[PDB]
Amino acid sequence: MTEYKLVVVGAGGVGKSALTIQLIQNHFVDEYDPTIEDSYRKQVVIDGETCLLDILDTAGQEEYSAMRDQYMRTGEGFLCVFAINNTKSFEDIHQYLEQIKRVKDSDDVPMVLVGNKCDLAARTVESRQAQDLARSYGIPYIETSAKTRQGVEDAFYTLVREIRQH
Ligand SMILES: Nc1nc2c(ncn2[C@@H]2O[C@H](COP(=O)(O)OP(=O)(O)NP(=O)(O)O)[C@@H](O)[C@H]2O)c(=O)[nH]1
Ligand SMILES: [Ca+2]
Ligand SMILES: [Mg+2]
Ligand SMILES: [Mg+2]
């Protein structure tokens, strides 16, 4: 059984915890409890192989930025999340991509760019703007809604695939 170390990163409140908890426990967390650092594990079949998903749900609050170097060293693939109704979170995710590369000394780190909260109509980040950012890093872009489950499995299983094929 192959184990995959997934890490979910991004700015405060973009929905990292809601995304992970939707994938693992199949319900939507409506309240907003800011995360320090939580771990989840789950056995799943992906392309006919049983996998162990080890998911790290990380802090978006700038307070805990010191914890970053460690978890980027350890993790194998990174789900990099912004919210489509938060332009600043899109500008911020760019800074996360550079840190992952820097910390891991590699321009080829398995990553997926995720535009979350796509159920909301107050969009300020157009899909094409995020596509352009993902293209310059050579990584996929997938929109999600933790609330409706749209794209949630697609995003996480795509990241597994990127790790697998690394
Ligand atoms: N409509 C909608 N709301 C969402 C979605 N994802 C998260 N939210 C809401 O946004 C708030 C923040 O979500 P949360 O998962 O805690 O974000 P976070 O990125 O983990 N925050 P932190 O970095 O502080 O730990 C919650 O009220 C949650 O219900 C989504 O896809 N759609
Ligand atoms: Ca709920
Ligand atoms: Mg959280
Ligand atoms: Mg604009």
From Swiss-Prot:
* Modification sites for N-acetylmethionine: M1
Per the record, residues carrying S-nitrosocysteine are: C118
Q: How does it sit in the membrane?
A: Lipid-anchor
Outcome reported for the amino acid change (mutating T144I): GTP-binding activity reduced by factor of 25
What is stated about the way this protein's activity is regulated? Answer: Alternates between an inactive form bound to GDP and an active form bound to GTP. Activated by a guanine nucleotide-exchange factor (GEF) and inactivated by a GTPase-activating protein (GAP).
What, per the annotation, is the impact of changing P34G?
No effect on interaction with PLCE1
Q: Where in the cell is it found?
A: Cell membrane; Golgi apparatus; Golgi apparatus membrane
Name the residue ranges of motif: Effector region.
32-40
* List of residues binding GTP: 13-18, 29-35, 59-60, 116-119, 145-147
What happens after mutating T35S? Loss of interaction with PLCE1
Nucleotide-binding: is it a keyword of this entry?
yes
**Sorted alphabetically, which keywords does the UniProt record give?**
Acetylation, Cell membrane, Cytoplasm, Disease variant, Glycoprotein, Golgi apparatus, GTP-binding, Hydrolase, Isopeptide bond, Lipoprotein, Membrane, Methylation, Nucleotide-binding, Nucleus, Palmitate, Prenylation, Proto-oncogene, S-nitrosylation, Ubl conjugation
GO cellular component terms, alphabetically, are: ciliary basal body; cytoplasm; cytosol; endoplasmic reticulum membrane; glutamatergic synapse; Golgi apparatus; Golgi membrane; GTPase complex
Supply one GO molecular-function term: GTP binding
Catalysed reactions, as listed in the record: GTP + H2O = GDP + phosphate + H(+)
User: What is this protein for, i.e. what is its function?
Assistant: Involved in the activation of Ras protein signal transduction. Ras proteins bind GDP/GTP and possess intrinsic GTPase activity.
According to UniProt, the name of this protein is: GTPase HRas
Native organism is Homo sapiens
Q: Which gene encodes it?
A: HRAS
